[PDB]
């Protein structure tokens, strides 16, 4: 009920400590010079236990903490949106319907519309200007209400940069296409696709400037627009450009700094929580946290200190640099010798050393493609037969 | 709750004050919040979600799943430029890397000079202006191995300043005569 | 110290809130199916977050057993039968049970979550209606 008598009880226990029948024990200040300090010691030990519970049950941090570190907290999480590709992106068609027949129908429609999109890219202007708009595969997204078709496109030759603003007064052969995709009122292709899908349809032509930022566009461009440079033999200048598209980055250093940045992120969040655990809590008396099920420390601004959209989001993103690429030309790309030929151009590395020293773990797309790899084959026909361009790219 | 009419209008646009008010009057005080460890819903950083940030929120007027504009409300009509460029400095250069430039690409003598200055401290200006280059033999060399005939490019080159300095160098490459002669020129400059 | 962050924005950073059941009747049963547990659980959290604001007691994302379709196919276009390769498809199932809520509020919940459904998820809703033995249907 109240310690006013438990104090007397403990005094009797001290008397017993000396002897069971003695008046009192060795008392410098009547058992008050350091007995109170020892009482405070046990109270603060109880605070230690409750406090580490307090911090542990309120921890959530991105993965990437090097185990060698000491200040790293016990918590970890690899599923941060910025550090792993959602497995729904693995499949070109992203749908689930309780009606399997409808599911099959929809995948058929997706494939056919994708082929139509391919066929709908080539353009003519004046019978000696052939413009091909290379496009990746289509990412079909089937929500419960609307369908979305998303793809990355690369124009063969953007208007010259040195050219003046003259482009503002006419619409390019590609702008016309992208506008009729979804901007025309009662004529856009989305309206037509709505009949096949009985849903509201959307299309997103995301633009890409370089062909080597995507495996589909890169192989497509080599196999469709660069035939003359390898038909009778790979040109040395073409090989030089293809091999020096990207500089020689230090994968080890890149990975090490990424891991160190994650370490700093976690450690400074931990410090924020610790300073709220100690510096704060003064006015608010203890036991109001109710550590059994409640874990609210304080103001979210204080739990997340100096973590804005301006510093955190960009430095934790993964698959940002291209640190390796391989190109395989195979088939009858030679008038001489009338046989099969394989030529391999391999540059860089094909291993993400980020996963080798940190707690971030690789995930295999479709259970056979490492997350850091994107690859594609494209086959075309020349006067001698069919030939294949196979491209593999490693992103770190 | 935390703050009622505490200058909240100065910090949030008037259009959202109704939502904050409703939240205050529906979520009770002393709510026993708990962080989620199974699933993640909030960003790792801290944001009030009151401003649409380019490159981190969907661009208005452009089609995208999770959009709320109709087919007659899209305001994007040009596709000749990359929508939503990068934020901040607009570049993602790693630490200790430089944007590619001319770099003496017009003359491999500049690359040779830079490399030899790096390795042994000779004068790039002297190598690039006061040295003359001349191939002597450029021939194909073959090795027979388990896989088959592995052809190699062999070059020999004389480099001299026409005032007493002279040297020759041999270079062997597996891919191109240009790399062969580059190596040969490197070796010659070393062996002046 | 800094700009205030009200409860509405502070709630996003914590687990979704629930409203206790006061009677116990099951008005609706929403089963979410997908091949991607990530979107499945994210969308389930969104549902449990909207239910609180709309006043619908929702139980939570009960994980029902996952279903594994299996196929085996030869790896060669022509005769090589000693080598075969297996393919699988996992269906992940979550369940959210809605108790003690009016039909119109429940309607509007389902309508909003359909408005903002993610990609690769599917909803099966079982609605329960209490009725009297004899109904005047004229």
């Amino acid at each position: 009920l109240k310690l006013l008598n438990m104090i007397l009880s403990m005094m009797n226990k001290t008397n017993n400590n000396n002897n069971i029948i003695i008046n009192n024990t060795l008392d410098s200040l009547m058992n008050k010079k350091l007995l109170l300090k020892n009482m405070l010691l046990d109270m603060n030990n109880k605070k230690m236990n409750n406090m580490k519970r307090m911090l542990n049950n309120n921890n959530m941090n991105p993965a990437g903490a090097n185990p060698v570190v000491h200040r790293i907290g016990p918590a970890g999480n690899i599923n941060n949106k910025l550090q792993h590709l959602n497995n729904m992106n693995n499949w070109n068609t992203q749908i689930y319907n309780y009606n399997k027949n409808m599911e099959i129908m929809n995948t058929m429609n997706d494939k056919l519309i994708n082929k139509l999109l391919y066929k709908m890219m080539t353009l003519k202007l004046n019978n000696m200007n052939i413009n091909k708009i290379i496009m990746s595969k289509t990412i079909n997204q089937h929500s419960l209400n609307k369908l979305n078709i998303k793809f990355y496109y690369y124009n063969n030759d953007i208007n010259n940069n040195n050219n003046n603003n003259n482009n503002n007064y006419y619409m390019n052969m590609m702008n016309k296409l992208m506008n009729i995709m979804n901007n025309n009122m009662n004529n856009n292709l989305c309206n037509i696709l709505s009949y096949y899908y009985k849903k509201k349809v959307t299309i997103e032509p995301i633009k890409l400037s370089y062909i080597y930022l995507n495996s589909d566009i890169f192989s497509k461009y080599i196999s469709l627009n660069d035939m003359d440079k390898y038909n009778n033999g790979i040109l040395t200048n073409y090989q030089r450009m293809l091999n020096n598209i990207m500089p020689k980055l230090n994968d080890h250093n890149i990975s090490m700094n990424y891991i160190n940045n994650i370490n700093n992120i976690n450690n400074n969040k931990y410090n924020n929580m610790i300073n709220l655990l100690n510096n704060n809590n003064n006015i608010n008396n203890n036991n109001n946290y109710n550590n059994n099920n409640n874990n609210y420390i304080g103001n979210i601004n204080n739990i997340y200190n100096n973590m804005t959209i301006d510093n955190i989001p960009m430095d934790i993103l993964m698959y940002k640099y291209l640190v390796g690429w391989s190109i395989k030309f195979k088939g009858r790309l030679s008038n001489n010798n009338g046989r099969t030929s394989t030529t391999n151009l391999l540059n860089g590395t094909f291993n993400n050393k980020k996963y080798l020293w940190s707690n971030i773990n690789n995930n295999y797309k479709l259970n056979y493609i490492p997350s850091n790899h994107n690859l594609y084959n494209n086959s075309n026909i020349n006067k001698n037969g069919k030939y294949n361009i196979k491209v593999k790219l490693n992103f770190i | 709750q935390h703050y009622d009419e505490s200058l909240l209008s100065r910090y949030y646009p008037e259009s959202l004050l109704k939502s904050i008010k409703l939240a205050q009057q529906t979520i009770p005080e002393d709510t026993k919040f708990r962080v989620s460890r199974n699933v993640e819903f909030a960003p790792p950083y801290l944001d009030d979600f009151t401003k649409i940030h380019p490159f981190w929120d969907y661009k208005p007027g452009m089609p995208h799943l999770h959009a709320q504009e109709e087919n007659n409300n899209f305001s994007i009509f040009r596709w000749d430029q990359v929508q939503q460029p990068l934020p901040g400095e607009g570049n993602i250069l790693p630490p200790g890397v430089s944007l590619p430039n001319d770099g003496g690409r017009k003359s491999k003598s500049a690359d040779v000079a830079a490399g030899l200055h790096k390795q042994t401290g000779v004068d790039p200006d002297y190598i690039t202006r006061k040295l003359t280059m001349k191939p002597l033999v450029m021939k194909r060399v073959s090795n027979q191995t388990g896989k088959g005939k592995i052809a190699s490019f062999y070059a020999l080159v004389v480099v001299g300043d026409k005032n007493g300095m002279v040297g020759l160098g041999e270079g062997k490459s597996r891919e191109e005569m240009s790399k062969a002669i580059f190596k040969a020129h490197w070796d010659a400059v070393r062996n002046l | 110290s800094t700009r205030p962050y009200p409860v509405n924005v502070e709630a996003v950073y914590y687990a979704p809130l629930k409203l206790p059941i006061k009677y116990g009747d099951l008005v609706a049963d929403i089963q979410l199916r997908s091949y991607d547990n990530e979107n499945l659980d994210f969308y389930s959290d969104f549902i449990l977050r909207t239910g609180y604001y709309l006043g619908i007691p929702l139980t939570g994302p009960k994980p029902l057993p996952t279903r594994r379709e299996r196929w085996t196919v030869i790896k060669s276009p022509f005769v090589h039968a000693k080598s075969k390769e297996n393919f699988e498809r996992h269906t992940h199932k979550r369940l959210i049970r809605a108790w003690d809520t009016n039909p119109e509020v429940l309607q509007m919940l389902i309508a909003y979550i359909t408005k903002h459904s993610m990609a690769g998820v599917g909803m099966k809703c079982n609605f329960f209606q209490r009725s009297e033995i004899s109904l005047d249907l004229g």
């Binding site: - | 208005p60 | 359909t114 408005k115 809703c125």
Partner: peptide, 22 residues
């Protein structure tokens, strides 16, 4: 980096056409 956020409450009229079919 700043762009105004316009709001429109989800009225039942807006959520219409997405009520359960049965």
């Amino acid at each position: 980096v700043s762009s105004e956020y316009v709001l429109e409450e989800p009225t039942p009229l807006s959520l219409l056409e997405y009520t359960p079919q049965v």
